[PDB]
Design a protein around this ligand. Structure first.
Ligand SMILES: [Fe+3]
Ligand SMILES: [Fe+3]
Lengths: 198, 198
């Protein structure tokens, strides 16, 4: 069975960037729902003992009756799991990954500008991601709980732009939530993932 | 130019079903942004005097570089404009359309049950609709600001299930927002649209 992870920090540890109340609803309600619905699909099946990354990377091979829930709920679980771990109260822009960002984009700010343009223009619910695609860094978006693993790309960083992730504090002002985000990225985690993927 | 229409009632006229704060943000910010972006797309161009309903229904004929803005922002203007008109503090379940809903579904409760099960299971952002398709009533969903006009169906009632429409008061509890909606449907307006469409 899949389990809801504990937050690696207090619920109020990302203030004033993300409110305590949002961290509660986002983790204890929204993420918990994807996990529960995911378990209802996979529990008692072959898929319970497969890695979630393997399942999402090969959705096509999931039985037709289970596929939508693995996509949506399995996506939800994976996506929110990674998200908590790439946030940190002690965010410092440090890691070898950032040296490589700098090489491709010219400066970290030019990278932040692209990620911002993509995340503020993503229409409806979804995520903006930094990924490795054949040894190379690229910024992509997905709708809803879709995941770049399904397209052959490894995620090392992600940003939630479903409105539940920012509405209580920021309401319509997603660009401010983007600006806030940069202050809380666990780049140490981003870089562990980067070093594993390339 | 496209324009942000006024609300036909006070911002607190739909309390407690839709909260005052939500009406302030939904209309003055979200809908207003749809209008702003749409106008930035279309004027100084030969599309500056084309109606929304024309462009939405013939989205395949809008030029490639303007299509997404017209789809998304044009959708958002059409959809929210209709949404205000189909809300009312003086909701009264009466009309030709209500007689015909009962004829087709057996009872009004079964109409609502179908509409609600489509509203609550819509994954991500979008709308639930009552449409006329060849003189026949049916209930459909669209993602984001997509509109059944694009598929040649006429909308006569719609419900916004983007998280911005309900997060401040309901948070994750979409179904409680759905059940609340029935108390504020302007059935008189829905009926006018119905008699025009068939
Ligand atoms: Fe989320
Ligand atoms: Fe809306």
């Amino acid at each position: 069975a899949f389990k809801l992870p504990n937050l690696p920090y207090a619920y109020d540890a990302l203030e004033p960037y993300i409110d305590q109340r949002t961290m509660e609803f986002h983790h204890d309600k929204h993420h918990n729902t994807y996990v529960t619905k995911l378990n209802a699909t996979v529990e008692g099946t072959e898929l319970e003992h497969q890695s979630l990354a393997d399942m999402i990377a090969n959705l096509d091979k999931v039985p037709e009756a289970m596929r939508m829930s693995v996509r949506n709920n399995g996506g939800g679980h994976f996506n929110h799991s990674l998200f908590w771990e790439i946030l940190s109260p002690n965010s410092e822009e440090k890691g070898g990954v950032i040296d490589d960002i700098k090489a491709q984009w010219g400066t970290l700010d030019e990278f932040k500008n692209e990620f911002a343009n993509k995340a503020t223009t993503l229409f409806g619910s979804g995520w903006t991601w930094l990924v490795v695609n054949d040894g190379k860094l690229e910024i992509v978006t997905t709708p809803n709980q879709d995941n770049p693993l399904t397209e052959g790309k490894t995620p090392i960083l992600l940003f939630d732009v479903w409105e539940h992730a920012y509405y209580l504090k920021y309401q319509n002002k997603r660009p401010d939530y983007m600006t806030a985000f940069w202050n809380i990225v666990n780049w140490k985690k981003v870089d562990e993932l980067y070093q594993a993927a390339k």
